[PDB]
Design an enzyme around this catalytic site. Sequence first.
Site, PDB file in Angstrom:
ATOM      1  N   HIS A  43       0.892  -1.135   0.040  1.00 43.76           N
ATOM      2  CA  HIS A  43       0.077  -0.047  -0.073  1.00 43.76           C
ATOM      3  C   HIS A  43       0.900   1.067  -0.129  1.00 43.76           C
ATOM      4  CE1 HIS A  43      -3.681   2.320   1.860  1.00 43.76           C
ATOM      5  NE2 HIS A  43      -3.072   3.006   0.910  1.00 43.76           N
ATOM      6  N   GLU A  97       1.164   7.875  -3.326  1.00 41.71           N
ATOM      7  CA  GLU A  97       1.826   7.396  -2.474  1.00 41.71           C
ATOM      8  C   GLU A  97       3.075   8.333  -2.072  1.00 41.71           C
ATOM      9  OE1 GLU A  97      -0.992   5.260  -0.675  1.00 41.71           O
ATOM     10  OE2 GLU A  97       0.845   5.297   0.313  1.00 41.71           O
ATOM     11  N   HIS A 101       3.102  10.635   1.016  1.00 34.60           N
ATOM     12  CA  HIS A 101       3.837  10.127   2.094  1.00 34.60           C
ATOM     13  C   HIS A 101       5.521  10.200   2.051  1.00 34.60           C
ATOM     14  CE1 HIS A 101       0.680   8.192   4.383  1.00 34.60           C
ATOM     15  NE2 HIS A 101       0.183   8.005   3.414  1.00 34.60           N
TER      16      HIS A 101
HETATM   17  N1  LIG Z   1      -5.771   0.935  -0.411  1.00 34.79           N
HETATM   18  C1  LIG Z   1      -5.873   1.423  -1.542  1.00 34.79           C
HETATM   19  N2  LIG Z   1      -6.073   2.692  -2.020  1.00 34.79           N
HETATM   20  C2  LIG Z   1      -5.603   2.781  -3.644  1.00 34.79           C
HETATM   21  C3  LIG Z   1      -5.248   1.761  -4.458  1.00 34.79           C
HETATM   22  N3  LIG Z   1      -5.255   2.436  -5.675  1.00 34.79           N
HETATM   23  C4  LIG Z   1      -5.491   3.370  -5.503  1.00 34.79           C
HETATM   24  N4  LIG Z   1      -5.748   3.879  -4.184  1.00 34.79           N
HETATM   25  C5  LIG Z   1      -5.933   5.240  -3.697  1.00 34.79           C
HETATM   26  O1  LIG Z   1      -4.610   5.647  -2.691  1.00 34.79           O
HETATM   27  C6  LIG Z   1      -5.155   6.218  -1.447  1.00 34.79           C
HETATM   28  C7  LIG Z   1      -4.462   5.771  -0.189  1.00 34.79           C
HETATM   29  O2  LIG Z   1      -3.961   6.878   0.770  1.00 34.79           O
HETATM   30  P1  LIG Z   1      -3.207   6.651   2.130  1.00 34.79           P
HETATM   31  O3  LIG Z   1      -4.027   5.334   2.829  1.00 34.79           O
HETATM   32  O4  LIG Z   1      -1.781   6.368   1.368  1.00 34.79           O
HETATM   33  O5  LIG Z   1      -3.050   7.816   2.873  1.00 34.79           O
HETATM   34  C8  LIG Z   1      -6.738   5.654  -1.461  1.00 34.79           C
HETATM   35  O6  LIG Z   1      -7.684   6.652  -0.844  1.00 34.79           O
HETATM   36  C9  LIG Z   1      -7.168   5.736  -3.103  1.00 34.79           C
HETATM   37  O7  LIG Z   1      -7.515   6.910  -3.430  1.00 34.79           O
HETATM   38  C10 LIG Z   1      -5.280   0.391  -3.782  1.00 34.79           C
HETATM   39  O8  LIG Z   1      -5.181  -0.591  -4.640  1.00 34.79           O
HETATM   40  N5  LIG Z   1      -5.530   0.352  -2.602  1.00 34.79           N
END
Ligand SMILES: Nc1nc2c(ncn2[C@@H]2O[C@H](COP(=O)(O)O)[C@@H](O)[C@H]2O)c(=O)[nH]1
Lengths: 208, 208
Positions: A43, A97, A101
Site C-alpha cells: 500500500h 503514495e 507520504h
Molecule cells: N488502499 C488502496 N488505495 C488505493 C489503491 N489504488 C489507488 N488507491 C488510492 O490511494 C489512497 C491511499 O491513501 P493513503 O492510505 O496512502 O493515505 C486511496 O484513498 C485511493 O484514492 C489500492 O489498490 N488500494
Amino acid sequence: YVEFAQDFDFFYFVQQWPGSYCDTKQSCCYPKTGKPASDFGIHGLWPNNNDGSYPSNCDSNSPYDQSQVSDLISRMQQNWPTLACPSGTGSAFWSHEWEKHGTCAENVFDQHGYFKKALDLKNQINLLEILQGAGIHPDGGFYSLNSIKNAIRSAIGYAPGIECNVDESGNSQLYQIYICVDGSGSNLIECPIFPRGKCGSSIEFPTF
Amino acid sequence: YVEFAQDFDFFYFVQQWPGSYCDTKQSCCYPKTGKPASDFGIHGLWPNNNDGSYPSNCDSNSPYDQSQVSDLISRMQQNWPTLACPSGTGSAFWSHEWEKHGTCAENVFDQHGYFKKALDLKNQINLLEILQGAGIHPDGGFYSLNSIKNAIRSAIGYAPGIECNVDESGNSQLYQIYICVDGSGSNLIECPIFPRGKCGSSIEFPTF
Ligand SMILES: Nc1nc2c(ncn2[C@@H]2O[C@H](COP(=O)(O)O)[C@@H](O)[C@H]2O)c(=O)[nH]1
Ligand SMILES: Nc1nc2c(ncn2[C@@H]2O[C@H](COP(=O)(O)O)[C@@H](O)[C@H]2O)c(=O)[nH]1
C-alpha cells in the site's frame, strides 16, 4: 545555512490483502494487465510520529517523476498493484503514495530510494508465506487475531499491527498489516504506537 | 507560475460564521469568555497547494505554547473563539490549528507570527461589514451564492472560496469563507484552486 529537523519519527510499512479490498460494498477493479497474484500487495511506506499523528503532503515542489524509477517499474507492477476503478496502470497510486507520504521522508530517501526500499521490504516480509506457513490461509476461514499477530512475530521478530475492514456479508476481515521501520529507514523496529485496528477477536481471511 | 514558499504553494485564510456552527445537529458551546460577538471568527490560516492537496501535521516536536502568543491573547479571545463542547478557553482550538496547519509553515512564520498574521488578515478583511454593505444580513433569510461572492470580490479584488454546511432543516448555509494569500503571507492573490463548497444557488445566512 538553515538546518531542518526530520518531520517524522518512524515508518509504517503497510501491505493490503486484495481479497479484502475487493469484497466490500464498494467496487474494485483489476489493473489493465489482469487479476493480480493472490498475495499481499504494497500500500505504502508511511512516515509517522510517536504520538500517533503523521505528516502528509510535505513538498509540493517534489512531484512524482516516474522516469526516476523506470528500473523499478516491472517490480512495482507485480508487487504494488492498484485495485481502484477504473482499471489502471498503477501510476496514479504510486504518485499518490510518493506525494502524500514519500515527500515527508525526502531527507532520507529520494524517489528511487523510497520505492526501492518499499520493494525490498516487500520481498523481506512475505506475509502470505508467513501466514500459510502457520496454517493460516486465505480460504475464507476465520482465524484469531492473536494467531495472525504471533505467526508474523515468530517469523520476522517484531509484532505487527493488524487492520480490519468489513466485507459485504458484514464479516470482519484481515485487511492490512503494518510493520514498523526506524526513522533512518535502515532496520525494522517495534512499533511505538498502533492505530485502531477495528478487528474482532476472530477475523476472516477471504480468498482472492 | 510564481511561487513564494518552498514546501507548499499558498495559504487559505479561513473564517467561520458562528450562527452556522451552532445551528446544526451537533452541539456547540460558547467559550469561557462568553457568547462571542455576532461576527465571523477565525478558523485558521491553512497552507494549501495548487493541486488541491495540503500539508498537515508537519512537526509534532513543535507543540503550541501560549507563552509564544501572550501579547496576542486578547485579540485571539475576541476574534478566534472556540465553539466546541465542552465550553473551553480556546487553547485546545488554537493548539490544534498550530499543530495541524501552523507547523507546515513554520519556516515562514513561528507561532507568534502565525497567529499574528491570521489576526492581521481579519483586521484587513471585515466580511460582515462587506456583506451587510451589499444588503446581505445574518437575519435567517436566504441569499444567492453569487451575490455573496460578488460582494466580497468587489471589496477585496478577488473571489473568495465559500463553504456551506447544513442546518437542522437540511438547508445549506453560509458557513466558512476562504481568502487566498500567497506563500509569503504578504499579499492577497486569485485562488489557484477553491474548496468544494457544497452550496446551493441560494443559501441561508443564519442569526446568532
Ligand atoms: N488502499 C488502496 N488505495 C488505493 C489503491 N489504488 C489507488 N488507491 C488510492 O490511494 C489512497 C491511499 O491513501 P493513503 O492510505 O496512502 O493515505 C486511496 O484513498 C485511493 O484514492 C489500492 O489498490 N488500494
Ligand atoms: N470549525 C471549528 N472547529 C473547531 C472549533 N473549536 C474547536 N474546533 C476543532 O478544530 C477542528 C478543525 O480542524 P481543521 O478544519 O483546522 O483542519 C475541528 O474538527 C474541531 O475538533 C470551532 O469553533 N470551529
